Amino acid sequence: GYSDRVQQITLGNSTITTQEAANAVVCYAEWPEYLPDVDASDVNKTSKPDTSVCRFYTLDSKTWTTGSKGWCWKLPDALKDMGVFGQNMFFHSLGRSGYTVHVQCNATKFHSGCLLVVVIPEHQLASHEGGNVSVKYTFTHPGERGIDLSSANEVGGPVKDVLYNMNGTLLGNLLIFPHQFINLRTNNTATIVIPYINSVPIDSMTRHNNVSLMVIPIAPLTVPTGATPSLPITVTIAPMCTEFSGIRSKSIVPQ
């Protein structure tokens, strides 16, 4: 009586149940694991807070309306302030982590709409100015708020044009990245497990984000007659196999 459909994920002191899942994606078919010695470089023993950092943090909720263009969060940024995960983050020189991402959106059998939930490794954004204008730090570190693709261009911020993925590629091809759809008629959640993907064994958690999670409405939300025209979307994310190394004074970052 197991269905692909019902699932439970327990991680730390927190549990999620979905009764309307559509399997789960594990990026590149690899599950998060700690850093092996053969791959290690820094000689420091690392710190593995385990259950105090590897639990589920639910970010603040978004509201899908008929005019929504899509939202974008960066990792580990989105979690920069969650509990002890965040403290560890500002206090060590280097850290590394994988995540379980669970995006939630329920409706009824009269609604229609379909969101794309995708994880993009190394999502370098484009400046809407063109040329070689850079995208300032603050703009690519929105924190739990994430970036709202239907917000206005700002100065020093990225471009927010959806048919171009914020980088000069077409929305249609985002499907080459680990992703899952939430089609109100099928699905009510999306779950993706992200292994740590980098060109170095461990890195800085503040100067470099290693994935952007993106939720994009593709088939517009259509509510039943005289229904309220909107649904909330909630994102809950859990660091998994986290390791921190090179402890010290506590980083100070712009803004």
């Binding site: 190394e122 954004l125 484009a126 400046s127 995208v135 730090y137």
Partner: protein
């Protein structure tokens, strides 16, 4: 190898063509799941689509130019093209760039070919064979100031001398600092409020300096350098969506404003053929 097996009528409870794309999978459906097929063999291996093959041919990565002329009274050799210099990079020209950016991280050895041809714009006489010197000036090492500085001694820095009209060829191991080169980097060099964003900060690989060894003749001679790059021993990770809009800058993803629609509009209906 069979490309298609033989398959006949079906009346089952087992439907391989109904799936749920919401899952993120592309189910491996074949012609024989939905029509009646006959056996056929592949006769093919997919040899020429190997990434080593795809990135393994020489591509032009840079065209520069230097001239041989009397430096007498020149206050700025660099500025007179008495010796140009190139900030090594692999995204200045776009044919090869779009190919590499199909991947996120890439690792390979490089084979460089350098072709140098001469031009004599101002009606001339006898051209004495010019010899070009190509130095590798990695970051931290004195960079040439005049076309005949102590720098050109290049006692510790690899340099090649070849003749204009000829070609020079040598191969450099993968010089990246990390395990792969980042084709993309969503980071900064530090948490500064105004530091540049992108890979520009990861791309540091220094520059390469060219000059003519010959002193000047009576006329002036323009030498134009073309650098070709071939990846050998390629390793590529994490495929990405291909580049759709035009490029504007080395190292940023930025596209131009008021660009044009990249998807061709139908001449007719959705229903049109």
């Amino acid at each position: 190898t069979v490309a298609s097996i033989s398959s006949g009528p079906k009346h089952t409870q087992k439907v391989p063509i109904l799936t749920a794309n919401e899952t993120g999978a592309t189910m491996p459906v074949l012609p024989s799941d939905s029509i009646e097929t006959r056996t056929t063999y592949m006769h093919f291996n997919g040899s020429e689509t190997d990434v080593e093959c795809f990135l393994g041919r020489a591509a032009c990565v840079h065209v520069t130019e230097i001239q041989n002329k009397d430096a007498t009274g020149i206050d700025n050799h660099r500025e007179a093209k008495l010796f140009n210099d190139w900030k090594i990079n692999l995204s200045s020209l776009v044919q090869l760039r779009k190919k590499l950016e199909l991947f996120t991280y890439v690792r390979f050895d490089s084979e460089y070919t350098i072709l140098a041809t001469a031009s004599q714009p101002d009606s001339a006489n006898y051209s004495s064979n010019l010899v070009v010197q190509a130095m590798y000036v990695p970051p931290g090492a004195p960079n040439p100031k005049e076309w005949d500085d102590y720098t050109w001694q290049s006692a510790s820095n690899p340099s090649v001398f070849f003749k204009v009209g000829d070609t020079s060829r040598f191969s450099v191991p993968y010089v990246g600092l990390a395990s792969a080169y980042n084709c993309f980097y969503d980071g900064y060099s530090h948490d500064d409020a105004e530091t540049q964003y992108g890979i520009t900060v990861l791309s540091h690989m220094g520059s390469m300096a060219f000059r003519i060894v010959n002193e000047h003749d009576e006329h002036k001679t323009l030498v134009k350098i073309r650098v070709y790059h071939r990846a050998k021993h390629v390793e590529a990770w994490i495929p990405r969506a291909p580049r759709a809009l035009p490029y504007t800058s080395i190292g940023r993803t930025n596209y131009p404003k008021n660009t044009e629609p990249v998807i061709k509009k139908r001449k007719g209906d959705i229903k049109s053929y």
